[PDB]
Structure formats: C-alpha cells, structure tokens
C-alpha cells in the first residue's frame, strides 16, 4: 500500500510528550528520530500514545533516558525497515540508559539496510537473547549488546514457541519479540524480498512485508526506490532520484533549491541535478549552472575543496567519516583515532579514498581495528602546511594491528614538509617504514628517536632474511636437522639460533605452544660447518612444522629466519588393543571385543589373534573332593646478553689499546581386517581357552606387530554330557561284594570328580558312597560291601566340574534273603 501522510523530516522530542504529537500523520521519516531526556514521565502516561502510521526510518532511532517507558510495542507497532543512510556513531539503532524498559516490542522490524544496533546499560530490559539478529541485520558481529538485565540477572524468556525456532551455535531456540508476538521467519527462497504470513513469496522489488504476494502495488516497503505507491526499481524520466529512497519531478527539486536560495537557512543545501539525482552538490569537476539546475562538467581541473573547522577533524566513527564523503581536497588536517575492535575498512574506503591532497598533517593515534592504511585509495600529496606540533607531517602511536602501510608496487605518495613519526606499532615493521621514507622523498629529513627500532614489529617476524635447510631425513623414531650457516657483519653478535617446532595436524599453521630449544652458535669455520641440531623425543607418524630463527644482539639488527617447513616422520608399532573383553553366548561361539590402541602409530592392516587349547590343572587330578573342605571352584635472560656484550666490549677495548696506527605352534588364527571385534566358532563344551590378542599396522613390508594380550575365555557345557551312560553292571562275590560297572562320560564337562550312588531297599533308607578318580581307576568303578538282603533301588549322581549330574534311573537288583 502507498504511504498516506506527510513525510515530516526527522526531528527530536525532549522534555515533554506534548511534542510527540508532530507524528500524527507520518508514514515515513526523511531523517532521524530521537526520543530522549524524559524524566517527569510515568508509565500511566504511555498507555495512550501509539503511531501505527510510522513505517520506515531513513537515518536512525535513538532512545536515551526516557523514564516510564516499559515497552515500544505500543509506540512503533509498524516500524518495518530502518534505512540507515546516516548513522549515529556507526549505529543504526541506539538504546542507551533505557531505564524501566522491559521488552523491546519492535515486533515489526524486518531489515536494517546499513548500520548496527547498540543496546546497553538498560538495567531492566530482557527478551533480548530470544531474538535472531541474523535475519534483521547484515553484519551481526558488529552489534554491541552488554550490561543489560539479561546477563547479570535471569529475566525469564517465557514466550510462545508454536513460534518458529532456529539454531544459533549448536542448539535451536525460539525467536520471539514479546510475550505475544515472535519474529517472522520464512523460507530462504525470499532472501529479503518479503513473504506473507502463509508463506507466499512477495515481489522481488519488495522488502520486509507485503499484502499481496508478487504485486509491487500492494507492498509496504520496497528496497530500491519509491514513486506514487507503485514503486519501481528505477523510476524513468522526468523523475530524478532523491535522498536514495524516492524520486520526484524536476519541479520539486527546483523549488526546493529556490527555497534554500532565497531563504538563507544555515543548514539548507543548494540542491543540484546530476545523473537523474537531486543531490545536495555534485562532486569535483562540475559547476553550478545559473540557467538550468544541472552542473555541467567544467573546462578546468578544479577539485572540490573540503574546508575544516579549526583546521582539524577527528575520525572515530562511520558518521565522522561520512561528512567527508565526496570531498577530494582537505583544507586542514586529519587525525584518525578509531577506538574499536571491529574493522571499519569497508565504510572508510567508501567514504574516504576519494581524497587526493591533504593541506595539513595526517595523524593516526590509538587506532586498533585498522589492519592497513589502504582505505586512502587516492591519497597522493601531503602538503603539511599546518605542521603538527613538534614539526611532523605523519604520525603513528599505539596502533595494535597496523600490519601494512601501503602497497608500493603500485601506490604513489608525496610529502612536502615535516617528518615521519612511528612509535609502538607491534604489527608494523621497519622495512615498511624505510620504504615509506624512500618513496616519500624525505630521506634527509629524519633524526634520532623518531622511528623506534625496539617498538615497531617487536612481535612480528619481519627481519626479511631467509635461511635454507641443507638436508634433513627422518628415521623410525627421530629426526635430524641441518641448515646453512649464517653470520652477521660482526660475527660476535650471533648468540645462536632459536628452533621452533610443534605438531601441525593440517598443512597450515600460524606463523609465530611452540616449544623452543637453545642452539649453541657454531665455531668460526673461516670449508664451512653447518650448525645443525638433533631433536629429542616425538610422536611418530605425525606432521611436524619446524622453523629456525636467528637470535642476534641489538647494537643494526640483521637476523634471519627460515620458511615454515613441514616434515613427516614415520610410523611405528601399535599398542595393546584397549579393553580386551571376551564373552560367550553359544556352546561354540565366543565373542571377543577390543578397542584400537591408544596410539595406533600406523594404519592397522589386520589383527593377529590366537585361541589355544589347554589341559586341566595338574593339581586338580591329585586333589580329593570328598574330604571336608571340598570347595571345588565353579569353573633473567638479560644477564646472558650482557655477559656476551661485556666480553665483546672488553675485547674491543683491548684491541683499541694494543694496536696503534703509524704517524610357531599353529594355534588357529585369523587376520581380523577393519574390525575391532571377532566371533569364533567350533569350540569344545565346557573347555577354557587362552586368547593371545595382538595387532599389526603393517603387512606387506614385514609384519610390524604389537605385543600380545592374554585373556581367558570359558565355554558353557552341553545339556546331558555329565550323565552316566551304559548299563550299571554289578559283580557280586561270595561275600556279597557288589562291584559296580559303568562307562564314564568320555566327553564330560571338563572332568567328573566323584560319583554319588544311592541304593534304597523297600522300607529302608538311602546310602551314599564316594567314587573318586583313583577309586574309579584302581577298583575299575565302585565296590560296595555289606548290603542287607532285598532288592535295592539305585540312583547314581555323577559329580563333574560343572556340578552334580542328573541321577540315574532307579536300578533294581535282588540279593538272596
């Protein structure tokens, strides 16, 4: 839908809500909105005010100490898009010292074109972590939200969700604005074109929200431009773009320029026309034409001078630099001081970089996020007419991240007067400064203690002297190092080389953990001896990153370093397979589990495992198990530097004074390949096994195998293996001696230790007798003596290693009465 209402260019409301009524008819704001400094206000005075008509803010929104305000859900229920043409300290929405605020309430915000959001020191605001700034902004990392109620307190983020949720770092979370509304999230096919509640994609030109999908006539905010409701990407003539958000007829711009001309408002601009754009003033190379409002190109190279108040301007924010946008010649001096933490290269290059000459000096102090000075794209000449105090033209102080000053393969520069000045730039190096001095042409304009040697690049390896490695080769376990000798012009200044080495998982490692080792400087060969060094201890088959840096006393420093060379050592034998556990589920199936060794030290080609048969314990055969006690088992530095320097200086003094000028057992085995487990079949019942477990990580070039691991596995017995089979034959002598015959269970559960014979006569009781192995052998079974006359019912129980077998069926034998 169109925007019915006065555009009402941006204003601010202070000291009373009676000034808030100017927005009674406002669909858009061509400016910035500031509501701040409200003290004598109460929440009872805010329940009535509401502005459903407000849709889009051009510049920014700032709220600063508005007492009594608890939520904006009643103030701006239709704030869709904040254009952010000009920011407030590189911020598009600032909410500062916002006492009494509970929830943000901006449940209609969709897209912020340019800028960031800084909300802090509210002391009462929650419902912040329950929002998704990724779909709102374009650079989330530039946000700044601290010192709210969310962190130090625990304001419960109770909200429907029902409402859509999304991941942030590693978990999903609902994205809700207030207790009743939530952020509208719809499929990514409409990146920014908007989408209806159902999910239909809006028009491509459209933005944020729309009523009729794929219809620019019924949109609420369209990204490109605006004209007569039915907005288009770029309006045709005779309509010229205005303020980067809408276009109007030439008559509008002409009468606005006439109004500014005749009414000498101090803030009015003589608007001109240049490429269908009613801009405040066209850039350098064009002149205001009295006849027609457009500025034709001039027949002369006249730049657009940029006069500066009091000859100075501090650049500490995007909005500070934006005042120089389009300017090309500065009639003053620039001091850059960006106290940040987020780089501003993009916006600085967009606003600056069109300047060519600086009348005064350029000063860079305390700036942090500046990684380079490349944003001065077209900086050519520094006149230095307004010289800095101390007679300087270039400055540098406490730049923590000034890496590169300029690219001198292509860039040009010129300094007229003054001298350079660099101090405490740990990421800037003297090579770049000396290139500064050579290219500028102020070589003879330098003095002592203007470019500190010990502060610039103190933590940046940039001595720019390369060192090669002669030859290296790695063995099974260790590695030998050797490199070409290096000597400064005065060889006594070399105190030895630093060696840096660490394990690098992947092919890239940061340059300057990092274990180091001292190296004794080599003897003066004056044949040359390569210094070399031998490492001590390492983890085999790992990627190692090594490099050597010389260490030379500061007298000019002429150190040297080597490239980061990655050296791969060899593999070795593995360790014991971790956690060797063997289990049995079936009579012949035993399942053994293991884990790969803690240090495999090589690609495990196969596992060599052996299962071995054992005999029953020798002492078991010689132990009787009917005797009482028959429990059968149920089987600090500066001093050294000064010492060197003192030795050198005494030698120098001596030389000065003295000299004057004239006037196998085949246990079954299997190569377990690509498996940390094994299942074995075909095992005897109730028989133990000795399992020898070992691993190898190399097969074809000889089996490089680990040590053996011993575990014990025992199988369960069969069902009816211990029962006595065969007839129970008995021999009766003249003394009624019963000599029992029975065939032993040739395949028992380990071994049968004893037998329990229970013979009972009709009306008599049950007797027992032990039949040990020696008893069963020497007597060839049992030998009963002294049996009363009558027929006895005999049950025999066989006692094996597993336990007592099933009783034999009652056998009846009749002796004479």
């Amino acid at each position: 839908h169109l925007y019915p209402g006065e555009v009402c260019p941006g204003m601010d409301i202070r000291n009373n809500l009676t000034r808030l009524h100017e927005l009674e008819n406002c669909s858009v704001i061509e400016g910035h909105l500031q509501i701040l400094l409200m003290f004598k206000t109460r929440p009872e005075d805010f329940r009535d005010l509401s502005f459903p008509k407000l849709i889009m803010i051009t510049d920014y929104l700032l709220l600063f100490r508005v007492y009594g305000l608890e939520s904006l859900k009643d103030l701006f229920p239709n704030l869709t898009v904040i254009r952010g043409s000009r920011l407030f300290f590189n911020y598009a929405l600032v909410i500062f010292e916002m006492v009494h605020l509970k929830e943000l309430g901006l449940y209609n915000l969709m897209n912020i074109t340019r800028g960031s959001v800084r909300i802090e020191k509210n002391n009462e605001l929650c419902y912040l972590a329950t929002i998704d700034w990724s779909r709102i902004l374009d650079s989330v990392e530039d946000n700044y939200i601290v010192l709210n109620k969310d962190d130090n307190e625990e304001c419960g983020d109770i909200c429907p969700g029902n409402c859509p949720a999304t991941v942030i770092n590693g978990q999903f979370v609902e994205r809700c604005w207030t207790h009743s509304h939530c952020q509208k999230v719809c499929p990514t096919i409409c990146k920014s074109h908007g989408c209806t509640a159902e999910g239909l994609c809006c028009h491509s030109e459209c933005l944020g929200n729309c009523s009729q999908p794929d219809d620019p006539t019924k949109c609420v905010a369209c990204r490109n431009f605006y004209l007569d409701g039915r907005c288009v990407e770029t309006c045709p003539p005779p309509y010229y773009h205005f303020q980067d958000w809408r276009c109007v007829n030439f008559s509008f711009c002409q009468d606005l320029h006439h109004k500014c001309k005749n009414s000498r408002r101090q803030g009015c601009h003589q608007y001109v026309i240049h490429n269908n754009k009613c801009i405040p003033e066209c850039p350098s190379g064009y002149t205001m034409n009295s006849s027609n409002l457009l500025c034709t190109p001039c027949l002369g190279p006249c730049p657009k001078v940029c006069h500066l108040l009091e000859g100075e301007k501090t650049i500490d924010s995007v909005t500070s630099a934006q005042e120089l946008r389009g300017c090309t010649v500065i009639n003053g001096s620039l001091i850059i001081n960006i106290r940040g933490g987020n780089n501003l290269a993009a916006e600085l290059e967009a606003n600056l970089g069109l300047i060519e000459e600086i009348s005064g000096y350029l000063k860079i102090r305390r700036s942090y996020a500046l990684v380079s000075l490349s944003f001065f794209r077209k900086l050519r000449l520094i006149r230095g007419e307004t010289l800095e105090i101390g007679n300087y033209s270039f400055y540098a102080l406490d730049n923590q991240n000034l890496r590169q000053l300029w690219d001198w393969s292509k860039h040009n520069l010129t300094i007229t007067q003054g001298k350079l000045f660099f101090h405490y730039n740990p990421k800037l190096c003297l090579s770049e400064i000396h290139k500064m001095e050579e290219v500028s042409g102020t070589k003879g304009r330098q003095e002592r203690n203007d470019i500190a040697l010990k502060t610039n690049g103190d933590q940046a390896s940039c001595e720019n002297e390369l060192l090669k490695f002669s030859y290296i080769r790695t063995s099974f376990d260790k590695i030998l190092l050797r490199w070409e000798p290096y000597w400064p012009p005065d060889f006594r200044d070399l105190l030895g080389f630093m060696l840096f080495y660490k394990e690098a998982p992947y092919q890239n490692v940061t340059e300057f953990s990092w274990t180091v080792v001292d190296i004794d400087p080599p003897l003066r060969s004056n044949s040359q001896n390569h210094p070399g060094w031998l490492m001590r201890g390492l983890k085999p088959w790992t990627q190692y990153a090594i490099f050597v840096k010389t260490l030379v006393t500061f007298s000019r420093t002429y150190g040297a370093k080597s490239d980061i060379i990655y050296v791969q050592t060899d593999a070795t034998n593995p360790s014991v397979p971790l956690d060797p556990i063997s289990v049995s589920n079936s009579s012949s199936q035993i399942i053994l589990k293991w884990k790969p060794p803690s240090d495999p030290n090589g690609n495990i080609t196969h596992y060599l495992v052996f299962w071995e048969r054992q005999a029953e314990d020798s002492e078991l055969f010689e132990l009787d198990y009917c005797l009482k006690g028959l429990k059968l088992p149920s089987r600090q530095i500066l001093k050294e530097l000064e010492e060197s320097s003192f030795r050198k200086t005494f030698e120098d003094y001596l030389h000065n004074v003295v000299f004057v000028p004239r006037k196998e057992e085949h246990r079954p085995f299997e190569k377990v390949v690509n498996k940390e487990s094994l299942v074995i079949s075909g095992l005897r019942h109730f028989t133990g096994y000795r399992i020898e477990l070992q691993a190898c990580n190399q097969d074809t070039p000889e089996e490089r195998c680990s040590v053996a691991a011993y575990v014990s596995a025992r199988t369960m017995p069969e069902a009816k293996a211990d029962d006595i089979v065969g007839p129970v034959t008995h021999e009766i002598f003249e003394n009624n001696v019963v000599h029992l015959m029975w065939q032993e269970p040739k395949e028992p559960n380990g071994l049968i230790v004893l037998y329990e014979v229970s013979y009972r006569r009709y009306g008599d009781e049950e007797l027992h007798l032990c039949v040990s192995r020696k008893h069963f052998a020497l007597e060839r079974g049992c030998r009963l003596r002294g049996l009363s006359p009558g027929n006895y019912s005999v049950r025999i129980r066989a006692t094996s290693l597993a336990g007592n077998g099933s009783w034999t069926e009652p056998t009846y034998f009749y002796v004479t009465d």
Binding site: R492, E651, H655, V660, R662
Partner: protein, 54 residues
C-alpha cells in the same frame, strides 16, 4: 668485507708479517682499530699502516 675481533689478530701478522707492530708511547683518540675494520670495511693499506718498519 669487514673483519672484527678475534679474527682481526689472525689477519694481522699475516698482512704485516715478519716485522712486528711499532710502539712508541701512549702519547684516547677513539678511532683505533675496531671502528676502522669491524664497524666499517677497511682495505689492505689501513692494515699495512700498522706495521713497524714500512
């Protein structure tokens, strides 16, 4: 090529040779040997002028 202490004596008695180094008396100028050959490069004649007879 610059030469400094330790090896400076080794270079001497070879460039000079046979004859020693003259010595009259202390008679500090602070341009003696180190800032002639160690700090800055020095030629053969500057070493020869430290001989005794020639």
């Amino acid at each position: 090529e610059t030469l400094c202490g330790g090896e400076l004596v080794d270079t001497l008695q070879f460039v000079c040779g046979d004859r020693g180094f003259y010595f009259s008396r202390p008679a500090r100028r602070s341009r003696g040997i180190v800032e002639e050959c160690c700090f800055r490069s020095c030629d053969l004649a500057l070493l020869e002028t430290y001989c005794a007879t020639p």
